[PDB]
Amino acid sequence: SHMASEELQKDLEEVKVLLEKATRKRVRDALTAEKSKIETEIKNKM
Amino acid sequence: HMASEELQKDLEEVKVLLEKATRKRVRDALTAEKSKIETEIKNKMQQK
Fold first, then answer.
1. CB contact under 8 A, A18 and B37
2. How far is A39 from A7, CA to CA, in rounded Å?
3. Among A10, A20, A31, B46, which residue's Cβ finds the most Cβ atoms within 10 Å?
4. CATH number of the domain within which B4 lies
């Protein structure tokens, strides 16, 4: 369900897959901002 | 600060990533970034 740990892990994995492909700074910055948000949501679960 | 040619390369890549992405929040974030880039390109083409 919404905001379940497994859903956040799937979000994070996709952002990492796309960061491996991305080369443009502007696009990488947008992806890294999302990555940071998802990682915080995961860490918040402790 | 922005350059038309560089924004067009960013647009090309955002498009490529959007071919691939499967997760709703990631697709939404990339679509929003694409839209912002397109607005900036329009303004730079006007200013050329």
1. no
2. 12
3. A31
4. 4.10.860.10
